[PDB]
Design a protein around this ligand. Structure first.
Ligand code: HEM
Length: 129
């Protein structure tokens, strides 16, 4: 697809994740198993997205100044970038299971683990200022 659509797709994917992280953070603060499962259901849908095809070479912030925050570095570290995405999917599965187990403590713990995967990747691959 055109750069405009992959950029569109990956932007929507990440916005959805951000909204999910935000909502689950609030649930973790005041655990309600029903709201957790609702959030987990949404996170599950989000994680079904194949994002590898969302980062084709030529879509870094240097190629498309201001259109994206993806750093050119991603393309010099695709194995690490994929690994970090993988870590997120795994952390996500744990958050989903904890929500479904109705386990508030595990949910909060898994959520910390998930947040960490977002940071681990952003630190090396997303544009700050
Ligand atoms: C962890 C679950 C996670 C969250 C939360 C998250 C959020 C997020 C947002 C809100 C954006 C900005 C979206 C927008 O344009 O409004 C964003 C952008 C990027 N992310 Fe991220 N992200 C999470 C996880 C990860 C992981 C696991 C990776 C790397 C393996 C990653 C990468 C990126 C990149 C690159 C961007 C820039 C996208 C762009 O501007 O085109 N994120 N993320």
């Amino acid at each position: 697809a055109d750069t405009k659509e992959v950029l569109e797709a990956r932007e929507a994917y990440f916005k959805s994740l951000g909204g999910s992280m935000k909502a689950m953070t609030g649930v973790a603060k005041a655990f309600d198993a029903e709201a957790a499962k609702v959030e987990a259901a949404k996170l599950e849908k989000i994680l079904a997205t194949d994002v590898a095809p969302l980062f084709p070479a030529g879509t870094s912030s240097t190629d498309l100044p201001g259109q994206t925050e993806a750093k050119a570095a991603i393309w010099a570290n695709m194995d690490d970038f994929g690994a970090k995405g993988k870590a997120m999917h795994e952390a996500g599965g744990a958050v989903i299971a904890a929500a479904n187990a109705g386990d508030g403590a595990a949910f909060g713990a898994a959520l910390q683990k998930l947040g960490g995967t977002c940071k681990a990747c952003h630190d090396d691959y997303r544009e700050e200022d």
